[PDB]
């Protein structure tokens, strides 16, 4: 990239926080004619101390194989850049890759490096702004739509900002995304992203600005950083370009909810939830952005969408279960959530009958009338639905999940 080149030209000016070290053709980096082309580009730092995952000797341009060679040209004549440029860009990349400098973050499998076209406090902020730990006040401000100048007067928002994402391919590394927006504009876009993601916390230890890695990890095949789909990591480009999130996101979180179950190995009092705070946040973001729906931050009982009402009904049935049989190692959320959300007509009869048995047991036991309250809630929710639909769409399933999360939270210690 020539952006990198310009960054080298920038940092190289200062005697510190940088470094000033030093056939023919058209240099595509610079655009200067008749300059000495590099036959073999200098290497990039791989490994945990560079671009994570790639081999220590990493490269952008690499024509080691005969397939990639074109128009009769050899190892780097296919990618013609002057020697100087070759050095420059590589060096700038390496300096940004050194973790000692704050301009770096690792997302899923890709490592992100960013910079401003000239010195600005943004470069110190964006390190945490998409990996949140004054900074919290700034985040709340930009999530509110306030301009960054109101919290950091030295923030010149007319400065152009750059973000780069590199993914490892053994010795080869690939460009996954690239943004060249202005500081103010993309800061506003990140604000809008965090505004969409906003949901009431499930437990008061969860952070107010969910780190994008935590959001991605929760869709992983086993809730570990590995097994994050690289394409979903790249798709969440959508965060700071302002466009729709990848359409594979909602089916991914719904798939996790299908294939998950409450592991009691957290060893807390609570058995781990199935619709966690972060999965509900992602579903809310997808419904706000891609589907243009309206989704609240907390429960809105003054609502009349059948998917939402069914989600609330599922939540109250689950609460009735967990009150009727305390401490059990399994709950309907472990088994019937996937089929309740996708095919209500086939399963809500059995869930309602089981909830009837649960209220039966609860009535004779102590809690002799939360036995009544849950039935009142069932009355007031079922009252708005004409029929259980045969099937529900993916976004209807998203609304089901959001409603379930809302009605579950608003019912932890109502009674």
């Amino acid at each position: 990239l020539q952006a990198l080149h310009g960054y080298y030209q920038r940092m190289s000016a200062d005697p510190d926080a940088g470094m000033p070290p030093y056939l023919c053709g058209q240099c595509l980096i610079t655009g200067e004619r008749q300059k000495p082309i590099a036959q073999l580009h200098p290497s990039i730092k791989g490994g945990r101390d560079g671009v994570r995952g790639a081999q220590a000797v990493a490269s952008i341009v690499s024509f080691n194989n005969t397939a990639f060679e074109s128009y009769g040209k050899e190892q780097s004549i296919n990618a013609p850049v002057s020697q100087e440029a070759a050095f420059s860009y590589v060096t700038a990349l390496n300096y940004l890759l050194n973790p000692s400098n704050r301009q770096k973050v690792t997302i899923a499998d890709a490592t992100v490096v960013f910079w401003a076209e000239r010195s600005s406090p943004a470069e110190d902020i964006f390190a945490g702004m998409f990996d949140p730990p004054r900074m919290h006040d700034l985040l709340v401000a930009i999530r509110s739509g306030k301009r960054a100048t109101d919290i950091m007067p030295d923030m010149d928002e007319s400065v152009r900002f750059h973000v780069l994402g590199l993914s490892p391919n053994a010795a080869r590394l690939s460009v996954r995304f690239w943004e060249v927006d202005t500081v103010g504009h993309m800061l506003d876009k990140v604000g809008r992203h965090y505004r969409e993601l906003e949901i009431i916390p499930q437990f008061n230890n969860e952070q107010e600005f969910p780190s994008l890695s935590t959001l991605l990890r929760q869709t992983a095949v086993l809730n570990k950083t590995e097994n994050i789909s690289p394409v979903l990591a790249g798709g969440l480009r959508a965060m700071l370009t302002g466009g729709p999130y990848p359409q594979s996101l909602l089916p991914a979180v719904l798939g996790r909810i299908r294939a998950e179950h409450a592991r009691p190995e957290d060893k807390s009092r609570y058995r781990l939830e199935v619709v966690t705070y972060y999965r509900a946040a992602l579903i809310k973001a997808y419904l706000i952005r891609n589907r243009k729906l309206e989704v609240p931050v907390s429960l809105d009982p003054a609502r009349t969408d059948r998917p939402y009402l069914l989600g609330r009904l599922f939540a109250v049935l689950e609460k009735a279960q967990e009150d009727a049989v305390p401490g059990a190692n399994a709950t309907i959320k472990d088994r019937y959530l996937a089929s309740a959300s996708a095919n209500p007509g086939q399963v809500f009869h059995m869930l309602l009958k089981n909830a009837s048995n649960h209220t039966a047991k609860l009535r004779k036991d102590p809690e002799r009338k939360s036995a009544i309250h849950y039935e009142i809630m069932m009355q007031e929710i079922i009252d708005n639905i004409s029929d259980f639909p045969v099937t529900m769409s993916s976004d209807e399933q998203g609304l089901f999940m959001i409603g379930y999360y809302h009605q579950r939270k608003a019912l932890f210690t109502k009674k």
């Binding site: 179950h261 472990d334 088994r335 996937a338 089929s339 086939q346 059995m350 099937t391």
Partner: protein
């Protein structure tokens, strides 16, 4: 062992009555279902396992008829058997540097173990025995009508560890399908059979296993499971005379005219097999 010469497709119909035909590791142990439509599923892997069990029980480890995936085997120890029987030292993590010895070890694996000869295997792990694709394939079984899995709670009047709860008994649960008819397709490939060594003896044993699959699989969680049809479509040549789907379609599964309400026995279903194309013969007699 000369290879078979004909392309075969087959349709398997099997029952379940108050049983868990295949448990889902995710939904606790609930029978696998298609969450968006409610139809029950049985992984092809499960049926392959039952076939393997049949092979092992009926041949009892006779030569050329061992099975590769067993309840307590270690795969590397089994691959070292092939390397020894080929006299090669097991190359650390690698194949033998001579391609012919690699072929010999892979063939010894194929020519001995029945289920490697049949279903194929991916043995490229530590001690490397190569790869096999398997002349035989089968798809997920899927019920002809949506199943309604019901949850049955049970109690044990004894406890394992030191406990004081028994004040109520130790609770456990079984999941069972009240009834469901499963249609499982399958495929047999001559071209790959030749490359593996799948002979008509093997094939005979195969149909045998399919017919007798469930008869020895009885367990407290399986219920009553049975094989109801094995409609085999023999093509007259190496490469078939008719598209698969065009043959599966001849096998029509419907509900009997006098049957109403939820199905609870095979008699609720009417099975009809059409006229096959002139290049195919049907042996529904299985």
């Amino acid at each position: 062992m000369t290879a078979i010469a004909n392309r075969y497709e087959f349709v398997l119909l099997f029952d379940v009555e108050n049983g868990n035909p295949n448990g889902d590791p995710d939904a606790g142990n609930m029978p696998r279902i298609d969450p968006e439509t409610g139809h029950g599923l049985v992984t092809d892997v499960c049926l392959k396992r039952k076939i393997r069990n049949h092979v092992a029980l009926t041949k009892e480890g006779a030569e050329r008829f061992n099975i590769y995936i067993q309840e307590k085997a270690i795969l590397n120890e089994t691959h070292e058997r092939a390397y020894t029987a080929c006299d090669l030292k097991p190359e650390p993590k690698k194949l033998p540097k001579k391609v012919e010895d690699a072929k010999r070890v892979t063939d010894w694996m194929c020519t001995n173990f029945y289920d490697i000869r049949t279903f194929g295997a991916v043995m490229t792990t530590e001690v490397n025995c190569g790869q096999v694709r398997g002349p035989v394939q089968m798809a997920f079984a899927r019920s002809v009508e949506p199943v309604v899995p019901q949850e049955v709670s049970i109690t044990r009047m004894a406890v394992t560890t030191k406990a004081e709860a028994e004040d109520n008994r130790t609770m456990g649960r079984k999941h069972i399908v009240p009834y469901g008819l499963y249609v499982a397709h399958g495929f047999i490939s001559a071209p790959l059979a030749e490359k593996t060594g799948f002979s008509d003896e093997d094939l005979t044993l195969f149909w045998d296993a399919l017919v007798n699959m469930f008869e020895h699989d009885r367990s407290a969680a399986r219920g009553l499971m049975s094989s109801r049809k094995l409609i085999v479509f023999k093509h007259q040549n190496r490469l078939g005379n008719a598209p698969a789907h065009k043959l599966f379609d001849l096998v029509k599964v419907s509900r009997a005219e006098g049957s109403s309400g939820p199905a609870r026995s095979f008699a609720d279903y009417a099975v009809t097999v059409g006229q096959a194309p002139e290049g195919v013969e049907v042996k529904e007699m299985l």
